[PDB]
Symmetry: C6
Subunit: 96 residues, 6 copies
């Protein structure tokens, strides 16, 4: 499955962006990660088309209420990514 991601500065932009992604396409919200500085990121998985609709829906909403840091789709993420980041079809992670 492809991967879509949205970064926001502020958590309410990011929760709203996520609700938008998920309502706008068959994508699944799989995890969310903050890195300090107030930066936070949501990840979704689904079909490549969906992740483009998703992240495009989610970017819209973020910008209406927050501050988008970045939006991006990786169509075919390396399986190696699922080991290290909270982007994985089964609660595999991002809790340490």
């Amino acid at each position: 499955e492809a991967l879509g991601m949205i970064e926001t500065r502020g958590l309410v932009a990011l929760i709203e962006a996520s609700d938008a992604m998920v309502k706008a396409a068959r994508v699944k919200l799989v995890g969310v990660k903050q890195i300090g500085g107030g930066l936070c990121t949501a990840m979704v998985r689904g079909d490549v088309a969906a992740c483009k609709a998703a992240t495009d829906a989610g970017a819209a909403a973020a910008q209406r209420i927050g501050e988008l840091v970045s939006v991006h789709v990786i169509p075919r993420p390396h399986g190696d990514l699922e080991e290290v980041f909270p982007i994985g079809l089964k609660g595999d992670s991002s809790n340490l």
Copy 2:
């Protein structure tokens, strides 16, 4: 149930904003999350009307004593949001 959220820069604005939300409407404070940078966020659930009264009460108070980062109501949050964020009618989360 709808979802209301308030972000503040500083925790005493946010505790006061929360006491305000909860006193002003039938909404329930369900969790609170910081993301570094001194940003912190409270979430409430209740009827759509309540979450508008709540967050409108809470914004007032925040601004009197702190620095509101953002206020917002999502009337019908996707169930997918409850998996990933501390917005959930049963201590399901935001402890890892």
Copy 3:
């Protein structure tokens, strides 16, 4: 019991502010929370009068040695606050 709170930027202001609060009135220091950015907050509980004496004693001291972010008393905090914040007469929290 009422609730008093002091925010400081820097932890030595905040420890001194707390020693001040607690020496100046019958209030009890119940917890302390940092939110990154170097922001940290102390909470006390006691009679409404005490929490005004407390926080007024604590603000004085903070400002002599640090940087007060904010001071504030909520006379009758909603019981809902004790679920989510380290403001509670019994080590109920703020450890996750």
Copy 4:
């Protein structure tokens, strides 16, 4: 094995940089570490040639979408590094 590393300010640059590294050379993504301030770092291991191809692929991508903080290859990292940093051929670490 050599060690390659990419730092980004923002996590979506860094996830994209990583997918790039790993697709562009026989290197293995071994861990990722944030240090607050929104700084985050990915580490890869492989042959010296690979880690140069990797990190050069990963830098490209980071800069297209984010803000690279730094890129660098250490051809022959001291074994002492594997004790203290998440750069190690076997989930040995960076969880405390």
Copy 5:
């Protein structure tokens, strides 16, 4: 016992300041706490005279190599402080 405290921006100032405090007087290093933003604080306990010698030794050293945020002695800290902060003659705390 009295309480002395030093705040530094940067951890090597703070480790050096601590070695200084402890070599210069009969005070005991009891804990150290960071609050993000790169702020970190060391606490010592001993006789009031010692904590003045200590913190005065420690301030000197900090300023030679770092950035002192603040220095301060509280001669007779409320017992309530030992519940909430890492200032306590017996590893009672500051691990949650």
Copy 6:
């Protein structure tokens, strides 16, 4: 044993500085600590001569690729330091 320390703003400077320290002298990397703000610090132990060679090797490298915050050797660190900081000849710490 003496103690050497390097602070960097950015983790790849710091990993490179460490590989340098350890290759340049008989010193041992004993731990590493971040304090938010993107500040991170490595500690080494060895003979006083070594820790001067080490930290001097490590500073060089840091500055070529990052931003050194500070370098410093304490020849004879108080045993009290090993209780509170990740500077200790036996995985005693800095995990809470």
